[PDB]
């Protein structure tokens, strides 16, 4: 039980129900004074959900650049990775890693997708439905191609970064048979542009909660109907979790979403957990023993054994860069 991944935020974690695959993210190197120290691109860490042990694999092939904020999912044992932030900025590249392989070395493949891709961006979300991947939102450059939806600049990026960036409300579909991008024509009122929101799919509903937009970290809840492309805003019956970004939102049943952690508008790291019951349209607080372990920019993955496995993220205000306390702890929630 020696092996364990380095601490990190902004990594991805995806699951086949038995394994949790962890890639990427960043941490600090305090000796060198580096607070954007990306984790090694060729490493893939596998957390075995039954044994609680980690194994590090070195991948080959078209290994993606080291990145924070990428959007990944595992569908039928294939890892798909879109977007992110590397040392030279945001990307819209798409990578696949097929784990249905009896080869001893796992191989990344960079895919040349057809159609018009999303803009280059990070800190977004993805829904999975009927052999397609449906991406929503994010933070990145002004879109350069014809795109349906809206984009709003982050005002401070006109002086605080080398190139202006902003939030989008875009919905893009990738068909994984042909690797073709498209966009659906939606109806209803889409959520505002946002990044660092959390997405979760139950049935044909793509839920999205919270996120950052302009000067707010939000607590609104919406779903996109993945058959009809109608957006719906859900107004819960009572008290809601406070507005936040960098939280996780994970399906735990056919009727429940599990929310943990995040970062408030006033920059407080959060250790609260809640369950949203879909049929009752109500939020309920979830009692747990990690009240002194707030996390933001962690990942959460459900196991087949009725648990949510939280990994990584930052315990304190990650925007105070030199003091940001990234974690490598596994927090297990019994749901």
């Amino acid at each position: 039980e020696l092996a364990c991944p380095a601490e990190r935020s902004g990594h991805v974690a995806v699951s086949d129900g038995r394994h949790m695959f962890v890639w990427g993210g960043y941490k600090s190197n305090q000796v060198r004074g580096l607070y954007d120290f990306y984790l090694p691109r060729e490493e893939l860490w596998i957390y075995n959900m039954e044994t609680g042990r980690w194994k590090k694999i070195n991948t080959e092939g078209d290994v993606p650049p080291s990145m924070s904020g990428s959007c990944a999912v595992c569908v039928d044992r294939v890892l798909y990775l879109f977007g992110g932030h590397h040392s030279r900025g945001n990307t819209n590249k798409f990578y696949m890693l097929d784990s249905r392989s009896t080869d001893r070395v796992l191989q990344w493949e960079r895919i040349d997708c057809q159609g018009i891709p999303p803009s280059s961006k990070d800190k977004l979300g993805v829904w999975v439905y009927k052999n397609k991947l449906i991406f929503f939102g994010g933070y990145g450059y002004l879109p350069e191609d014809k795109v349906l939806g809206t984009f709003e600049f982050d005002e401070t990026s006109f002086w605080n970064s080398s190139h202006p960036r902003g939030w989008n409300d875009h919905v893009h579909i990738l068909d994984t048979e042909t690797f073709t991008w498209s966009q659906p024509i939606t109806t209803g009122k889409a959520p505002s542009p946002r990044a660092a929101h959390a997405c979760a799919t139950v049935g044909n509903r793509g839920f999205v909660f919270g996120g950052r937009y302009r000067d707010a970290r939000m607590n609104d809840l919406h779903y996109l109907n993945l058959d009809t492309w109608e957006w719906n805003e859900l107004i819960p019956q009572g008290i809601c979790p406070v507005g936040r970004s960098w939280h996780s939102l994970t399906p735990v049943s056919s009727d429940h979403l599990f929310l943990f952690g995040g970062f408030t508008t006033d920059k407080q790291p959060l250790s609260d957990a809640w369950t949203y019951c879909i049929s009752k349209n109500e939020w309920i607080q979830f009692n747990h023993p990690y009240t002194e372990k707030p996390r933001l920019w962690h990942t959460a993955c459900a196991s087949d054994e009725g648990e949510v496995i939280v990994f990584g993220g930052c315990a304190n205000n990650l925007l105070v860069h030199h003091r940001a306390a990234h974690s490598n702890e596994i927090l297990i929630f019994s749901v």
Binding site: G10, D36, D154, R165, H321
Partner: peptide, 7 residues
């Protein structure tokens, strides 16, 4: 730190 902007 560009990586954390926008969240």
């Amino acid at each position: 730190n560009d990586c954390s902007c926008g969240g």
